[PDB]
Amino acid sequence: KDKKTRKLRGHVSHGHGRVGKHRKHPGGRGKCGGMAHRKTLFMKYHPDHFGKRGMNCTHLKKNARYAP
């Protein structure tokens, strides 16, 4: 099938609403605001994103630890 743009020719506000809009970056760029305004996105879908777990191994070697 074709892309969605080929059906949105003719309609103002291509698919993004008149009152809303397609603005540049509302909410911020990337995954910022994970503790402020996208906290609901991180409490729901990535609750283990923030913080530290466990003992760091500086340069884990894959071939030495290979044991399938």
């Binding site: 996105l41 729901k44 879908y45 994103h49």
Partner: protein, 56 residues
């Protein structure tokens, strides 16, 4: 960002990122075959490879 997805690790923030396209890839292959043939013709009896050991 909006939905449930893996967190994005896309590293195109630097405007200095280059791209190495591979349009020379079929052409380099025919150049590479031609040089190997010309090496074999330069050393006609001698093998084109060295004798190399078997190592673990």
């Amino acid at each position: 960002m909006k939905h449930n997805n893996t967190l994005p690790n896309n590293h195109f923030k630097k405007t200095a990122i280059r791209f190495k396209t591979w349009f020379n890839q079929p052409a380099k292959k025919e150049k590479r075959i031609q040089l190997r043939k010309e090496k074999a013709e330069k050393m006609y009896p001698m093998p084109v490879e060295k004798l190399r050991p078997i190592v673990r």
